[PDB]
Write a protein that binds this ligand. Structure first.
Ligand SMILES: Nc1ncnc2c1ncn2[C@@H]1O[C@H](COP(=O)(O)OP(=O)(O)OC[C@H]2O[C@H](O)[C@H](O)[C@@H]2O)[C@@H](O)[C@H]1O
Lengths: 151, 50, 16, 473, 101, 51, 101
DNA sequence: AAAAAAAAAAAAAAAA
């Protein structure tokens, strides 16, 4: 059963916002998979990432910024997530998150330039509440909120 | 201008800086002489800036 | 008076 | 070799009962203790200064990025961090004309110009508070830069700029906060440079207060002050044992009256029925004659500690079991005996003296870094050293710039466990609400008491001052 | 069957009136579709709008203003609504709303 | 204690003092911020605290 | 300088029209870019098309058919073409071609 | 009018 939320991003540039979002979502009870969250690294990771996107991911959140817009790893993750989206017969699968004010909606990546994006540009908490209402609308699997897990 | 290998009097623009200490005897913790470190400056290396 | 400063001993350290 | 013991780093409480070593990180991830729906903000000042304040408020609405997040956490945005709506729309604005603010400024007498400058702001603040329908939680006073240059003691106006009360202190901030006490109006002053400094230029062309790398912590320390003054609980301590009042005595000089008269101020910290924390001041300023006594006479000492035991009694029900009066000054037997009599039999009366005068500097053998923060060299059961300022790995640096100076903590009176005393003052170093830093170099009782002392000794006509810190810091 | 009312509008500017009207209609028992309140995040929004207009829009409400008169998204929604009007043979399918003096 | 007083003026002054002192103490000596202070009064006081 | 003409289409269904039109236009002297024209494929093509539509395309021709009308790749190309149309401030950029009766 | 042992008020810079 796919119960995990995937967050793709630019690791050396967008790490802090993804940290905040993951530590809030996990505190709220949403299973989150991210490359930052796991400590240590090994050659297997690239396989693991892929299989997660194809086996346990229920929603795919793509952090959109001028860094993550045209990053090859991010593009690969977007492509495999899109293939999973066609496989699952679900349109509400890829949910871009725009966090950059120099990345206007004009210059979005072609795979997500057509998808509606939750707007984090002005206030992060407005975007987070939009994420929450979207998740409860789409019946994303959830556990009882426990900030102890985030701690 | 350097004891052992370590420099004590140096240059900074037109000011020659010198390392200095102040001592004070105290007996309450143990028979001890306390030292405090300070940095002073001169214009020509001999006369202190007023 | 000793020219060598009084040394204490700390059980906790750190690294850069 | 001399043994040097280390105390566990104290932990502070955040929302949902979650505990975190740091304050910024705990706020960013867990949020305040209480629900503050919104901050109705009142702004007073020149029209040229309102645009800058509006720009800064919008700026802090969005997240702020600092140079290195490891050295100091970034600011996720006010409404996300504090779960509180603080918009630039709905601010109640009071205007100060440039001609009016300049008429008083160019005066030969510093006392008179400061008095008139304070009056110009406070009169408008009182008029807005008392004769306007709008509700304002907190009042931001944005002042220009020339005033700060020429509104504090020993400020000599240039001879070309001079164009033309003695019971009031020549300090703008002190007199300002002193004259607003009887009305209980939470106000918190901004300078124009503390605002969008990028406007202010020097001869070279760099900002005078260049905060380019350190904007995140600036937003952190401004937002937390606004949240506290608006009626919020940012964080609280969790390691404080039940039944312990603390109180901090600070002596300040009053120059207006003949002889300093050495006004003394105190602050309390204790628990509540349940788990709530109480951290207020105890402002009954007890003047001490003689130029340099700093020892409080028996009658004032008895009145002070009697007020302290009561202010615990009505709010908890019974008397404290151990009160730990921290004090930067040493206690003589005269005031201690007075303290003892009013003290009941069950209460353990302890008097602790804290000092930074002792010149001890531990230099680590190798490495360009200072000693770890929290090391304690216990001289004996009654006296010890504690490094409140030092290196702590989470901040990735040391809180000092040079090698820090310890706190010389000695149990002057009473018995007290030295390790327990050292384990509490380090916790008091973390409850600084005026600034959201990792920890403060001195316990907040000795700091907030000094603040309220510097504020209470600016005006002579203070009567029954508020005991809440919102009106002081 | 079509039981939705599409309130086309200028999203960057006309949010307040559209939200008020949508809430009033919903409280009145009218099922209403609008991007600011009903559009799902992470969808093909243009495709979703076209589908809603083509199959589920029983009635089309257009908010007319100095902004919405020449906004490209509003014009495209308007044209799709006109095509649906031709399909349904209902001359009263679309009702413009003028709010700008 | 205050209410059962024979003199109407003294009893009403004491009843008002009891509430106003607590309200002033809360306003001056607490960190909480309160927009509006609701004063609930029972019926017996309403019956015997007016001319 | 933008001098390429982009011909978007439904790849496995509109081979004949796209082939004929491209082979005509190239002979006429018009630069033509299309997916069926280039021989061999790699992972890069999904990126490549994007930059073309943003950096070299001067006119965008959309083959309109019952297949290509609701084709996801065609839809993405149409979206990026519309947005580069907006950025160029040139309204006569996308030139649809309807070939289905 | 000194001594050491303790006090606070103030201004300046540099970071946090
Ligand atoms: N991935 C996205 N792509 C496009 N727009 C987006 C996206 N995410 C958010 N938006 C928001 O979509 C909005 C684009 O506004 P516009 O088309 O320029 O001006 P109009 O007056 O003609 O909007 C009318 C229709 O266009 C709307 O899409 C709705 O479908 C309207 O019904 C911006 O607020 C964006 O922040």
């Amino acid at each position: 059963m796919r119960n995990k939320i995937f967050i793709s991003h630019a690791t050396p540039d967008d790490n802090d916002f993804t940290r905040w979002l993951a530590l809030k979502l996990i505190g709220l009870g949403y299973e989150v998979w991210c490359d930052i969250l796991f400590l240590d690294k090994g050659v297997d990771f690239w396989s693991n990432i892929e299989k997660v996107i194809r086996e346990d991911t229920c929603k795919f959140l793509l952090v959109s910024s001028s860094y993550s817009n045209q990053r090859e790893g991010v593009l690969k993750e977007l492509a495999v997530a899109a293939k999973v989206k066609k496989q699952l017969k679900d349109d509400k699968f890829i949910i871009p998150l725009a966090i950059d004010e120099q990345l206007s909606y004009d210059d979005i990546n072609i795979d997500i330039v057509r998808l509606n994006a939750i707007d984090f540009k002005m206030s992060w908490a407005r975007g987070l509440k939009d994420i929450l209402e979207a998740f409860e609308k789409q019946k994303v699997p959830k556990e009882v909120a426990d900030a102890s897990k985030s701690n | 201008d350097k004891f052992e290998k370590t420099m004590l009097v140096g240059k900074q623009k037109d000011k020659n800086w010198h390392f200095a200490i102040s001592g004070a005897s105290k007996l309450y913790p143990f028979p001890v002489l306390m030292i405090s470190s300070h940095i002073f400056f001169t214009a020509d290396g001999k006369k202190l800036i007023d | 008076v000793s020219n060598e400063p009084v040394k204490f001993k700390g059980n906790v350290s750190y690294n850069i | 070799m001399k043994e040097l013991i280390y105390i566990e780093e104290p932990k502070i409480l955040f929302a949902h009962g979650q505990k975190c070593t740091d304050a910024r990180d705990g706020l960013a991830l867990f949020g305040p203790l209480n629900n503050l729906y919104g901050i109705k903000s009142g702004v007073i000042g020149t029209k040229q200064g309102l645009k800058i304040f509006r720009d800064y408020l919008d700026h802090i609405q969005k997240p702020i990025y600092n140079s290195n997040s490891i050295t100091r956490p970034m600011f996720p945005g006010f409404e996300a961090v504090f779960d509180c709506k603080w918009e630039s729309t709905g601010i109640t604005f009071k205007e100060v004309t440039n001609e009016d603010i300049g008429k008083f400024l160019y005066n030969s007498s510093t006392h008179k110009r400061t008095y008139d400058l304070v009056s110009l702001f406070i009169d408008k603040i009182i008029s807005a508070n008392k004769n306007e329908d709008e509700n304002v939680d907190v009042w931001f006073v944005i002042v220009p830069d020339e005033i700060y240059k020429y509104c504090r003691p020993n400020s000599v106006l240039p001879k070309e700029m001079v164009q033309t009360t003695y019971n009031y202190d020549a300090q703008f901030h002190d007199q300002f906060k002193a004259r607003l006490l009887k009305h209980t109006i939470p106000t918190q002053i901004f300078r124009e440079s503390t605002l969008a400094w990028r406007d202010f230029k020097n001869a070279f062309g760099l900002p005078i207060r260049d905060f380019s790398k350190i904007e995140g912590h600036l937003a952190w320390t401004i937002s937390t002050a606004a949240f506290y003054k608006a009626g919020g609980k940012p964080w609280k301590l969790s390691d404080v044992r039940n039944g312990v009042c603390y109180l901090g005595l600070v002596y300040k000089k009053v120059e207006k009256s003949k002889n300093p008269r050495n006004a003394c101020c105190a602050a309390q910290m204790f628990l509540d029925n349940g788990d709530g924390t109480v951290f207020k001041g105890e402002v009954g300023p007890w003047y001490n004659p003689k130029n340099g006594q700093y020892h409080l006479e028996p009658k004032e000492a008895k009145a002070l500690l009697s007020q302290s035991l009561q202010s615990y009694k009505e709010q908890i029900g019974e008397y404290p079991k151990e009160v730990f009066i921290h004090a930067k000054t040493r206690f003589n037997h005269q005031e201690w005996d007075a303290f003892l009599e009013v003290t009941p039999k069950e209460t353990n009366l302890v008097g602790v003296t804290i000092s930074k005068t002792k010149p001890l500097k531990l230099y680590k053998t190798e490495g360009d870094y200072t000693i770890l923060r929290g090391n304690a060299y216990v001289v004996n059961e009654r006296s010890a050293f504690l490094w409140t300022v030092g290196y702590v790995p989470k901040i990735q640096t040391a809180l000092s710039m040079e090698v820090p100076n310890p706190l010389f903590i000695e149990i002057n009176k009473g018995e007290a466990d030295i390790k327990q005393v050292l384990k509490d003052i380090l916790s008091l170093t973390k409850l600084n609400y005026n600034a959201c830093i990792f920890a403060d170099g001195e316990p907040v009782t000795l700091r907030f008491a000094d603040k309220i002392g510097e504020i209470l000794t600016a005006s002579t006509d203070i009567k029954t001052p508020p005991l809440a810190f919102k009106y002081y810091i």
